[PDB]
Amino acid sequence: EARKRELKKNKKQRMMVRAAVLKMKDPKQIIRDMEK
Amino acid sequence: TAQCFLRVDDESMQRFHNRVRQILMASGSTTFTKIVNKWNTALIGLMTYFREAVV
């Protein structure tokens, strides 16, 4: 039963990591700075 | 002469209770094939040891 909570925590961590990766070099962060 | 009516004793019954409770508490990662194998082992422990009394 707790394996579901563990998988949910792992998926939440992976989603946060993917969001941070997409936002750090985002079009508003990286590509937006590419023009500057 | 006689008729030796049988019946499963409470000791084997409690042993089966403990086995079922241990299997139910074996969760978290156990593949279902292993669970079915353990239950088949438990049942062929109960059945095939006494058959006339299991019914």
- Encoded tokens for B31: 């593949």
Chain A positions touching B29 (Cβ under 8 A) are: 3
A1 Cα to chain B: minimum distance (Å)? 6
Chain B positions touching A1 (Cβ under 8 A) are: 27-28
Question: Is-contact B39 B33, C-beta < 8 A?
Answer: no
Instruction: Provide the Cα torsion B36, B39, B41, B44; round to 10°.
Output: -120
Give the type of residue at B51.
Answer: R
Instruction: Provide the Cα torsion B5, B10, B15, B19; round to 10°.
Output: 90
Structure obtained using: cryo-EM
